[PDB]
C-alpha cells in the first residue's frame, strides 16, 4: 500500500523524531526488541506505512537518521527503543556545522549528502509504491537547517510527484538562543518555499506557555514536551494507518489548505490538553473539543490567530464519535466568529474522522490552519535579518564557505514577498 | 453458536446436545453434528434463581416474560445513576397492566459476598448468587467486563457495567439496550425495550 519514509536531520531532528517513534511503536504494539505484542488486528493491518518486516518476525522503522556529529546519534542508539533502528540507517559526520548554514549547505554537507542520499534511495525504492516523505528538523541550527534542506532540494528533483511534509521548528520569538537565528531562518525559508509541499511551524515559546497555562507542569523536560509534538505528528497521519468514517491523507490536506502554491505554512494545535488534577473532572465531548481547539492558548505556534484571518483551516478528529458534531460545530464556529474567517472563501473547514483514538483517550482532535496571522512571524525575522545584514554582522562566516553576497538579498526578497502575499488576503 | 462461538454456555450446550445425538445415533441419515437450530439447553439449573424472598424458582417460571439480564456493580457511579430509572421503569410499566410483562435477573460484578448481598437487598427482581459459576459463565457468554481481566479471545467487549440485555430461550441476545454504547442513551434507552417480540419461550 502506501509507505512514508521518515527523515531526521540534526540534534533537534534526532531528539524530536526519537520520541515520534516511541509513540508510534506504542500505538502499533512494538516492543523495544522489535516484536509485536497485544493481539489486536487493527494494530497490524496497516503497519507497512512506517515499518518493515525482517522475515524473522521483527519490525524495523523506515527511518533515516542523519547528523553531522557522532555524538547525538550515540544518545539515540543507547537508550531503550534505540535497538529498534537499523544501524545502517544512521549516517555519520566527523566535522559538524557550527550553526553555520553555509558549511551545512555547501561545504561539509556536500561530502555527506552523497552517502545519506544513497541510503534514502535504497530504502524508498525497495518498498511497494511510495506515498510520501517527511522531515523533522530545526531551522535555528546548522545541520538541521543547512544540510537538511539540501536533501529536501535533491530528492524533490529525484522524486518529483511524491508528497513532502516538514515539521520544522522555527527560531524562538522572545528568548532566542543560537544568536545566528535570522541568518539561518531566512536562508532556510526561501529555499523551503519552492521545495516543500506542507510546512508545519512549531515554536518553543508556544510550547512552554502551554506548560503553564494549560498543562500546569512544574519541571517539563524535552521528553515531556516532545510527547506533545509527536502526538501532533501522529494526528496528521492517523488515516494512513487506521480506518475512518471519513478518510483523509496528507494529499487531502494539501488540496484543502493551500489555495495558492506559496502559502503552505500551517499552525498546529492539539486537543484535549488537561492537567492530571483536572483529568477526572473534565467532560470530553466534541463541542467541548472544538472550543478548546480554537484558542491562541492551544496552538503550538507562537503567533496570535485573532490578529489575522484563517484563510483555510482543518481539524482531523480521532475517536468514536458522531458526524454532526464534527460538522455542525464547523457552522457553529464560522457563523458567530465571522471576523476571524476570510470571506471570499465560504465554509473554510476540512474535517476528517479516524476511529481509533490515541492510547488511553477516547476522543482527540488535531488542528491545521492556514492563517495570515503568520505574517507577524516572518516580519519579526525580517527586521532582525535586515538589522544584522545592514551592518554586515557575522557575514564573514557565511561568505568564506563559497557563498556570495547576492544570495542574502535574494533571501530577504523571497521572504518579503511572502510577507506581502499574506498581506493582500487580509 | 450465538452470539459468540467461544462461550461456556455454548460449549456446555454443544457437549450435552451432541452427547444425546451420538447416543441416539448409535441406538438407531441422522445429521451429525446437530444443527444449532436442533440444539436446545437448560439455561438456568434448578437452584440458580432466587427472588426477593430468597425462594428458589426454576427456569420454567420465566415462560411468556420479557426477561433482561442486568449486569451491575455495587460501587460503580454509572450503576448508581442507572439504578433508580431501572426501578421506576420496572415498577410502572409492569404494574400498570393486565399482564406481567418483564422480569430482571441480576448478575453481580461486586467484590465479595458482603457487597453482593448488600446491593441485592436494594433490589426486587431476581438474582444469581455470586458463588454460583453461572455468573462468571454468563459474563463470558455476553462479553461484559468492567476491565480486561478475564481473556476474551481476541474480540471486543460487548459493553461495560452497567448493562441491560434482553435475552432469549437459548442465550440469544434478543436486543441490546443502549445504556452506555454506540447510541449512548443514558437512562432513556429503557424506553427502547419492546416486550412484545422478545418472549422467553
Amino acid at each position: 500500500m502506501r509507505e512514508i519514509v521518515h527523515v531526521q536531520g540534526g540534534q533537534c531532528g534526532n531528539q524530536i523524531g526519537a520520541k515520534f517513534w516511541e509513540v508510534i511503536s506504542d500505538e502499533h504494539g512494538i516492543d523495544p526488541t522489535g516484536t509485536y505484542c497485544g493481539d489486536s488486528d487493527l494494530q497490524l493491518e496497516r503497519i507497512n506505512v512506517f515499518y518493515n518486516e525482517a522475515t524473522g518476525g521483527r519490525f524495523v522503522p523506515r527511518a533515516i537518521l542523519m547528523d553531522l556529529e557522532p555524538g547525538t546519534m550515540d544518545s539515540v542508539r543507547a537508550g531503550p527503543f534505540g535497538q529498534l533502528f537499523r544501524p545502517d540507517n544512521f549516517v555519520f559526520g566527523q566535522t559538524g556545522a557550527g550553526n553555520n548554514w553555509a558549511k551545512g549547505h555547501y561545504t561539509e554537507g556536500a561530502e555527506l549528502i552523497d552517502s545519506v542520499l544513497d541510503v534514502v534511495r535504497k530504502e524508498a525504492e525497495g518498498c511497494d509504491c511510495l506515498q510520501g516523505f517527511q522531515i523533522t528538523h530545526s531551522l535555528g541550527g546548522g545541520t538541521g537547517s543547512g544540510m537538511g534542506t539540501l536533501l529536501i532540494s535533491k530528492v524533490r528533483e529525484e522524486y518529483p510527484d511524491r508528497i513532502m511534509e516538514t515539521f520544522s521548528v522555527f527560531p524562538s520569538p522572545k528568548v532566542s538562543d543560537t544568536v545566528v537565528e535570522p541568518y539561518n531562518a531566512t536562508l532556510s525559508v526561501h529555499q523551503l518555499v519552492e521545495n516543500a509541499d506542507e510546512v508545519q511551524v512549531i515554536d518553543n515559546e508556544a510550547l512552554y506557555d502551554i506548560c503553564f497555562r494549560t498543562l500546569k507542569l512544574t519541571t517539563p523536560t524535552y521528553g515531556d514536551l516532545n510527547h506533545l509534538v509527536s502526538a501532533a505528528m501522529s494526528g496528521v497521519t492517523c488515516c494512513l494507518r487506521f480506518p475512518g468514517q471519513l478518510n483523509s491523507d496528507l494529499r487531502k490536506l494539501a488540496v484543502n489548505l493551500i489555495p495558492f502554491p506559496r502559502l503552505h505554512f500551517f499552525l498546529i494545535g492539539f486537543a484535549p490538553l488537561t492537567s492530571r488534577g483536572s483529568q477526572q473532572y473534565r467532560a470530553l465531548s466534541v463541542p467541548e473539543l472544538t472550543q478548546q481547539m480554537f484558542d491562541a492558548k492551544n496552538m503550538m505556534c507562537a503567533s496570535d490567530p485573532r490578529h489575522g484571518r484563517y484563510l483555510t483551516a482543518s481539524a482531523m478528529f480521532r475517536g468514536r464519535m458522531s458526524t454532526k458534531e464534527v460538522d455542525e460545530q464547523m457552522l457553529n464556529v464560522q457563523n458567530k466568529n465571522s471576523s476571524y474567517f476570510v470571506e471570499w472563501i465560504p465554509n473554510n473547514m476540512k474535517s476528517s474522522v479516524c476511529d481509533i483514538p490515541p492510547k488511553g483517550l477516547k476522543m482527540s482532535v488535531t488542528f491545521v490552519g492556514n492563517s495570515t496571522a503568520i505574517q507577524e512571524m516572518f516580519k519579526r525575522v525580517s527586521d532582525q535579518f535586515t538589522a544584522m545584514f545592514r551592518r554586515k554582522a557575522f557575514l564573514h562566516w557565511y561568505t568564506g564557505e563559497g557563498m556570495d553576497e547576492m544570495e542574502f538579498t535574494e533571501a530577504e526578497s523571497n521572504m518579503n514577498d511572502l510577507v506581502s502575499e499574506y498581506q493582500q488576503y487580509q | 453458536s450465538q452470539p459468540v462461538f467461544a462461550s461456556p454456555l455454548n460449549v456446555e450446550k454443544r457437549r450435552l446436545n451432541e452427547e444425546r445425538a451420538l447416543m441416539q445415533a448409535q441406538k438407531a441419515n441422522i445429521q451429525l453434528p446437530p444443527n444449532y437450530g436442533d440444539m436446545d439447553l437448560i439455561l438456568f439449573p434448578e437452584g440458580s434463581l432466587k427472588n426477593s424472598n430468597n425462594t428458589v424458582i426454576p427456569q420454567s417460571h420465566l415462560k411468556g416474560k420479557s426477561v433482561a439480564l442486568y449486569f451491575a456493580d455495587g460501587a460503580d457511579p454509572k450503576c448508581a445513576s442507572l439504578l433508580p430509572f431501572l426501578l421506576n421503569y420496572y415498577r410502572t410499566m409492569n404494574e400498570g397492566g393486565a399482564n406481567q410483562k418483564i422480569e430482571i435477573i441480576f448478575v453481580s460484578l461486586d467484590r465479595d459476598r458482603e457487597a453482593f448481598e448488600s446491593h441485592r437487598a436494594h433490589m426486587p427482581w431476581l438474582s444469581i448468587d455470586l458463588e454460583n459459576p453461572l455468573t462468571e459463565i454468563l459474563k463470558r457468554h455476553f462479553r461484559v467486563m468492567k476491565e480486561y481481566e478475564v481473556p476474551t479471545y481476541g474480540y471486543g467487549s460487548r459493553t461495560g457495567v452497567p448493562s441491560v440485555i434482553v435475552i432469549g430461550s437459548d442465550g440469544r441476545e434478543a436486543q441490546f439496550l443502549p445504556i452506555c454504547s454506540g447510541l449512548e442513551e443514558g437512562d432513556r434507552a429503557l424506553l427502547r425495550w419492546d416486550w412484545r417480540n422478545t418472549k422467553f419461550a
Binding site: D26, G29, D31, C37, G38, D39, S40, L42, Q43, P243, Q245, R320, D355, I356, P357, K359 | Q2, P3, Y148, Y155, G156, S157, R172, S181, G182
Partner: peptide, 22 residues
C-alpha cells in the same frame, strides 16, 4: 513497559452475526 490494546472498532461493534428470521 507497555499495555495491551483494549480498543474496538465501530464496524466490529455494530456489524455482528445477525439472527436469521423464521
Amino acid at each position: 513497559p507497555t499495555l495491551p490494546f483494549n480498543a474496538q472498532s465501530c464496524y466490529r461493534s455494530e456489524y455482528v452475526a445477525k439472527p436469521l428470521p423464521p
